[PDB]
Design a protein around this ligand. Structure first.
Ligand SMILES: *[C@@H](C)[C@H]1/C(=C/c2[nH]c(/C=C3N=C(/C=C4\NC(=O)C(CC)=C4C)C(C)=C\3CCC(=O)O)c(CCC(=O)O)c2C)NC(=O)[C@@H]1C
Ligand SMILES: *[C@@H](C)[C@H]1/C(=C/c2[nH]c(/C=C3N=C(/C=C4\NC(=O)C(CC)=C4C)C(C)=C\3CCC(=O)O)c(CCC(=O)O)c2C)NC(=O)[C@@H]1C
Ligand SMILES: *[C@@H](C)[C@H]1/C(=C/c2[nH]c(/C=C3N=C(/C=C4\NC(=O)C(CC)=C4C)C(C)=C\3CCC(=O)O)c(CCC(=O)O)c2C)NC(=O)[C@@H]1C
Ligand SMILES: *[C@H](C)[C@H]1/C(=C/c2[nH]c(/C=C3N=C(/C=C4\NC(=O)C(CC)=C4C)C(C)=C\3CCC(=O)O)c(CCC(=O)O)c2C)NC(=O)[C@@H]1C
Ligand SMILES: *[C@H](C)[C@H]1/C(=C/c2[nH]c(/C=C3N=C(/C=C4\NC(=O)C(CC)=C4C)C(C)=C\3CCC(=O)O)c(CCC(=O)O)c2C)NC(=O)[C@@H]1C
Ligand SMILES: *[C@H](C)[C@H]1/C(=C/c2[nH]c(/C=C3N=C(/C=C4\NC(=O)C(CC)=C4C)C(C)=C\3CCC(=O)O)c(CCC(=O)O)c2C)NC(=O)[C@@H]1C
Ligand SMILES: *[C@H](C)[C@H]1/C(=C/c2[nH]c(/C=C3N=C(/C=C4\NC(=O)C(CC)=C4C)C(C)=C\3CCC(=O)O)c(CCC(=O)O)c2C)NC(=O)[C@@H]1C
Ligand SMILES: *[C@H](C)[C@H]1/C(=C/c2[nH]c(/C=C3N=C(/C=C4\NC(=O)C(CC)=C4C)C(C)=C\3CCC(=O)O)c(CCC(=O)O)c2C)NC(=O)[C@@H]1C
Lengths: 160, 67, 54, 161, 161, 54, 160, 160, 161, 160, 161, 161
């Protein structure tokens, strides 16, 4: 949350909130209607974004789905799409909160260790969330595509 | 276990109670042997008088076989 | 005079969000195209020049 | 820490689903309250020395604790007291901006009881001090923003009691 | 900490005599254990990530613990549980090389129960994880080494529960 | 030449102690003699002497 | 009776029978014509409702009329109808009393130990009282049936 | 176990074990091998003893398996045989332990509350384990049948 | 313990003021709902055992908790669980009569969390057993009275969670 | 008796005797002839038991019979050997009873207060019954001396 | 609590199966232990106070604890000391008869350390008194029953210290 | 409990010797003070209602606790606070007659802070009530006799703080 981030920075500097942080909170608290509209767009298009981005990922990288791959069977593919739904939910949470702190606290700290333990190619997970970003920007309005693509961008950067 | 059947009248010497108290004023009760000395002492501390006490359970003069 | 006899299985546990069973049908609807088995034997490859050099 | 929108996000996260209509309604409730929270935070941040000055004058000065030998005596301890009420007012402003009292029992109330017990600090005297801040801020900012500030300040009082 | 050999050395030294026949056949028992323990340590250090990997796969994965709401949920908590199981497996291997659980109750179990109660870590789920490590180690190292490894792992379970 | 798919579902579950799966077959082999539905009218029973009178 | 229950409740806490129960006693002694009408209706139609209740009881649980059952033999079935007639008379006693204490004093203390010694299904006895309640509710006129339903539901609740 | 019941009695009476009681744990540990023989022959013949017991119950009490019954179904007979085998396990545990303590601690405390929640006849399950007793006396040697059938007499008397 | 009426009285007592119109129309709401609460009380008191019977039948029979190793195994633990569901149903009926959850706060949920944690009682299976009680009583007593019973049983679930 | 201890335990737990307890009664009514034979041997040879035990007691602790003492004088030694005969008869009563409760209710309840009012060292009486069991095991068969020493053992434990 | 026989019965009952040879061997082992524990408890019940009075005479008598300043001087607390040692010897004989130390940590060691910390009872001196009880018991009853009493008294020492 | 004379006896018994000359001097100092202690105790026992009346009047009436919602509100709680101050004055009279402040932590301060913390009793209001008690007592019995009352009421304040 942007309020949580500004409070954390003000607490670290041991001071009250600056007017710049405070009217950023004002601007967010007025303009949150567009962000919740983006969140409803993603929630309504939850299944089709994951489905199309999964198809595009398996076209681009068919060796995560080949024999010997990490996600071979239909159940393993279902776990892949489950992780895609997880990260889409986190991007929706980041769009709503206005800051990447829920995404960091839930699904980006220790993701390298988790996917090392699972054997999963994290560069292919970055490709997966990249195709989710591409599909969402395709079916979303351009300013809304940029607003959601900021958080998609952060998830791509922290995975890769 | 060689119990006593006693009856006693225990008045209230300090309080005027408004609930019904025949059931703990004048009562007939079965008291065991090893509890009867302490119980009779407790009545005589409370100021009540032992109206009557008899050995309903057990036999007097039994040296053994009382448990 | 009908009789209600229950089953060895209990009631089915209600499927929740984190369980990937709800994505099994969508994985089937994808049906991801696997790759063909690669017919390389690697005895005929020679490691002195097939490694690139730039 | 946690504010209202992160509380909504975590409440959706523990059950695993996305944000439904009731979550958006709570979000719009917080977005409606955000104007009041921002203006109250600006007022308290502008006047924050005067609030603790009036509170210490109203509830702490000319008493046994500031008569010599007390804990308010020995000016280092007085400056630490002014710093403590400044901390209480600043973190109450943080909780008022947040809309959730998680920062209060994370970054203030954690170990505060046994801090004051180890330092010999009068607990109910501190509680009276935060209540003095409560009606000073209530008279400063209004009834509703003062109500929210009172909620977080007597949350601090109840944690300290 | 101490192992069995320094245990019998210290037991001789506390009463202040030299090595007697009980010390002799206790040392003979430890040297007879010997090769089996060092080979089990070699194969565990070989496939070190394998036991914890399919132990979490056997016990913890695809359940309400790793679903939202559970404590295995979120990637930081997942990596912390992997770290905890690597700790448990490494210290069980150390106790297996030692022949005594001194490193177990002196490096692991003290404070672990109360810090897990503070963090809300499920004791029963950690117990089932340790049982999964016991089963996979029994499948990987043999029968006798597997069962003494199981003795050390359910010593960890008995201390934690 | 296959990868064993991580079948997380408890299908092909070993029927442990305490299940009625271990007694379904013996219930079949017993095949209990279920009694027929009796034809009692419960409307023509005069409750003055049909009640025992001893 | 409700007067007896009010006297007992006043005597338990040593009161003088407050108007909060004395108005209820007044309402009971004024409205007793309706409950006497209920009682004479049940007394007049006592045999039809107990026969239909036994019919639905044997419809739902024909175990007891089966040859292994407790009510088997056409004498034990007559005893079943006799016990159900006993409980119907207890219901009429309760509806003229105004409360549940005559049914409690006559037929609910130790009924569990009684039917344990007799080997009968007490849950089937409760089901018989349920069917008697339903047939009496069908025969009676709405609010009168709801008034008798409290006494009936007391009998099922203390039976089960 | 007989030792744990005697030691609970001695612990409550604030004394050491009486020399008669030490003499009787002495008698139990001298005569314990026949109890192990009872346990191993019941473990060997568990399926046939429960076959004969269930079949003769279904002959003797047809109301149990009649329509409307609690044990009407094929499923319901299977879970009845489950309860049969549970009580057989309790009898084996008791003859190993030398006392009634595991039977009462596992399968008798609260069993009336359980079986009245389930609607099952406790006299019928007592008849079932009585039939286990009689077929056990038929199948197993006569001298050890005294102890085994006696513990069966305990469970039928405590259950009925 | 307090019902809705005495909760209103005590809240106005701490407020130090008489009953304003909010107190009056909350009292009128309770007086409107009282007939519904009495009828639902009569139905639940009639079917107290059968609600628990069908709820435990449709929630946790023939499952791993009733299997050996599960916590509903043995007749002692089973009858204790049935008495627990009876406690939950009776106290939910009490709270439905009261119009307040103070009886659930002080007589049910007080110590129940650490009691079940000490006993090893499965919290999620207990919660879904209470959910089964909710569905049975909602099908039995009606939609609106079932909704108040459901929100009090869900309050028990949230306190136990 | 052991039947009295078993019947007190069974009445306390408010049901019939467990088959552990009927096993107690069965083995007691097999061994009662042997117990009666042991008690008859002690009754026949009682005089050498008390005389030799008192003589070696006086040898072990001459302070008891030293002048000014409790047992000093022919009169006081006569009373002391009468106590020895009392205790030996009580142990024979325990042998024929099969338990230690007649021993308790005749001579071991209030014995400490008895000998404190009499000025008698209970540790010296404990040494006295130690020499009692020594002489009894000397002139008694070893398996018989096992249970005789068990009952003397209880006397030593409760009275020491 | 639970003994060895009830322990193996419960270890069968957690999986819900009958007793196999892995129960048979340890069950016959407890039967082989048997009469030794019976006669050891018999002779302890013979000279029950005597181990206590030689133990105090060898260890606690004529030292700083019975000298003033020590926590065993005065008749009331030395009475409490010998009552404690009667309790320890009685319950160690109880654990020896049971064949398991469940009665020790169920009946003795629960809260004993913290109540001795509240009373200021010397932990090391109580441990040394238990060692005196152990050595007098081992000199009395023999080697095997002596070391059975020794391992249960050392369990008491390890729990208390 | 303990007084000055039994404190002398216990200090003699800790080091284990008889009563020396300094012990006799402390006893004679107590015998010299005893006339003043008896006179002050008689005056306080005669006027004990007036001390608590004037102290509550000068320290507790017309305050936030006395306004509704506060702890001094609800006449039951009001009379309980009066009874608490009566207990404080009576045990302070006991301590002044005794000569040692052991009766306060043996019969007053044992769990008193925990009691007031669980009860929501204002600590500083109780402390200033004790200050009013000792001021009224020192004004009544004089400065020299009121010195010991000041000692023990301030000991109550230090224990309760
Ligand atoms: C004239 C000399 C100046 C002045 C003084 C002034 N001071 C106060 C108030 C307080 N001063 C103190 C001081 C101390 N606390 C300590 O521990 C120490 C060192 C030992 C000191 C010196 C305190 C605590 C107070 C608060 C009131 C109290 O007595 O507890 C005032 C009063 C302010 C008011 O409005 O209450 C004044 C007037 N003021 C000036 O203008 C001169 C420069
Ligand atoms: C045939 C003679 C009997 C019969 C039995 C019957 N049992 C059930 C169901 C259950 N039985 C149990 C019993 C136990 N749980 C334990 O842990 C132990 C050992 C300590 C026992 C003995 C339980 C818990 C159930 C409930 C579900 C389950 O099987 O776990 C039924 C089914 C009742 C239903 O409504 O489903 C039946 C019919 N029927 C009889 O008449 C005899 C009593
Ligand atoms: C005239 C009506 C009579 C009278 C009254 C009187 N009362 C006080 C002081 C107080 N009265 C209370 C009462 C309450 N506390 C509670 O919690 C409740 C229940 C809701 C009640 C009724 C209290 C707390 C006080 C203390 C002071 C305060 O204002 O709170 C006074 C004042 C006495 C003084 O010296 O301050 C008076 C005068 N006095 C009479 O003579 C008439 C008979
Ligand atoms: C799919 C594009 C890629 C991939 C997927 C894959 N994932 C798993 C299994 C798991 N993934 C997680 C991840 C998370 N847990 C969290 O709490 C969060 C944040 C909310 C995330 C992202 C977990 C825990 C698992 C374990 C199983 C479970 O559901 O708990 C698998 C299965 C591996 C296995 O051995 O079972 C797979 C295959 N694999 C790929 O190749 C793609 C790159
Ligand atoms: C009054 C008409 C004459 C009389 C009375 C007197 N009564 C008592 C005390 C007691 N009265 C009873 C009687 C009852 N207790 C009950 O609970 C009930 C019914 C609800 C009744 C009728 C009892 C039991 C006592 C003794 C216990 C008590 O005090 O409550 C006394 C006191 C006797 C004593 O010595 O304490 C007296 C004197 N005596 C007269 O002179 C009046 C003419
Ligand atoms: C049933 C839903 C599940 C469950 C139950 C279970 N409960 C117990 C025992 C106890 N239950 C309570 C609860 C309460 N007592 C109260 O007085 C109140 C409020 C009025 C409540 C809520 C308590 C205190 C106990 C402990 C006391 C006792 O022994 O009964 C057990 C037994 C645990 C044992 O070790 O015997 C069980 C099994 N567990 C399940 O698996 C069911 C899903
Ligand atoms: C002498 C008149 C008679 C007598 C004495 C005797 N006493 C002991 C040894 C001990 N006595 C005590 C008792 C006390 N402990 C205390 O703290 C106090 C005063 C507060 C007393 C009175 C204790 C504890 C002992 C043991 C030694 C120790 O200091 O711990 C003995 C020795 C017995 C032995 O076996 O060592 C004796 C002989 N006995 C008589 O016969 C005289 C009549
Ligand atoms: C004696 C070995 C050493 C010693 C002990 C000591 N104990 C007490 C008093 C108590 N001891 C206990 C402990 C127990 N309660 C139990 O139920 C059991 C066994 C299961 C034990 C071990 C308790 C509760 C008390 C207090 C009640 C009582 O006195 O019986 C004291 C007295 C403390 C005091 O002065 O108040 C002492 C001194 N201290 C030593 O120095 C000996 C080495």
């Amino acid at each position: 949350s942007i309020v949580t981030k500004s409070i954390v920075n003000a607490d670290a500097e041991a001071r009250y909130l600056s007017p710049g942080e405070l009217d950023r909170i004002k601007a967010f608290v007025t303009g949150g209607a567009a962000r919740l509209r983006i969140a409803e767009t993603l929630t309504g298009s939850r299944e089709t974004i994951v489905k199309q981005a999964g198809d595009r990922l398996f076209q681009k990288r068919p060796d995560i789905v080949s024999p010997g791959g990490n996600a071979y069977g239909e159940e393993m593919t279902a776990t892949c799409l489950r992780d895609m739904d997880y990260y889409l939910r986190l991007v929706t949470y980041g769009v709503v909160s206005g800051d990447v702190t829920p995404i960091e606290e839930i699904g980006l700290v220790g993701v390298r260790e988790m996917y090392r333990s699972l054997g999963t190619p994290i560069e292919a997970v970055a490709q997966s969330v990249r195709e989710m970003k591409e599909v969402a920007s395709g079916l979303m309005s351009s300013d809304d595509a940029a607003e959601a693509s900021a958080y998609f961008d952060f998830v791509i950067g922290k995975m890769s | 276990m060689r119990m006593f059947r006693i009856t006693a009248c225990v008045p209230s010497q300090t309080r005027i109670r408004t609930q019904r108290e025949l059931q703990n004023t004048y009562f007939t009760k079965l008291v065991p042997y090893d509890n009867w000395f302490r119980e009779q002492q407790r009545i005589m501390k409370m100021g009540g008088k032992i109206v009557k006490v008899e050995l309903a359970t057990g036999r007097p003069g039994t040296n053994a076989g009382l448990a | 005079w009908q009789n209600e006899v229950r089953r060895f299985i209990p009631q089915e546990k209600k499927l929740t969000a984190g369980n990937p069973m709800n994505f099994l049908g969508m994985a089937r609807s994808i049906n991801p195209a696997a790759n063909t088995i690669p017919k390389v034997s690697a005895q005929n490859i020679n490691i002195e020049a097939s490694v690139p050099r730039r | 820490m946690q504010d209202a929108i992160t509380a909504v996000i975590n409440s959706a996260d523990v059950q695993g689903k996305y944000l439904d209509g009731a979550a958006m309604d709570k979000l719009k409730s917080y977005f409606a309250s955000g104007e009041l929270r921002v203006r109250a935070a600006s007022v308290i941040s502008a006047n924050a020395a005067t609030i603790v000055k009036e509170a210490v004058a109203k509830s702490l000065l000319y008493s046994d604790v500031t008569r010599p030998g007390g804990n308010m005596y020995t000016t280092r301890r007085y400056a630490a007291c002014i710093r403590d009420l400044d901390y209480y007012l600043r973190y109450a402003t943080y909780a008022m901006l947040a809309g959730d009292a998680s920062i209060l029992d994370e970054r203030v109330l954690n170990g505060l009881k046994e801090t004051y017990n180890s330092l010999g600090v009068p607990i109910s005297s501190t509680v009276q001090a935060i209540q003095a801040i409560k009606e000073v801020t209530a008279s400063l900012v209004g009834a509703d923003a003062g109500k929210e500030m009172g909620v977080y300040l007597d949350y601090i009082c109840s944690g300290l009691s």
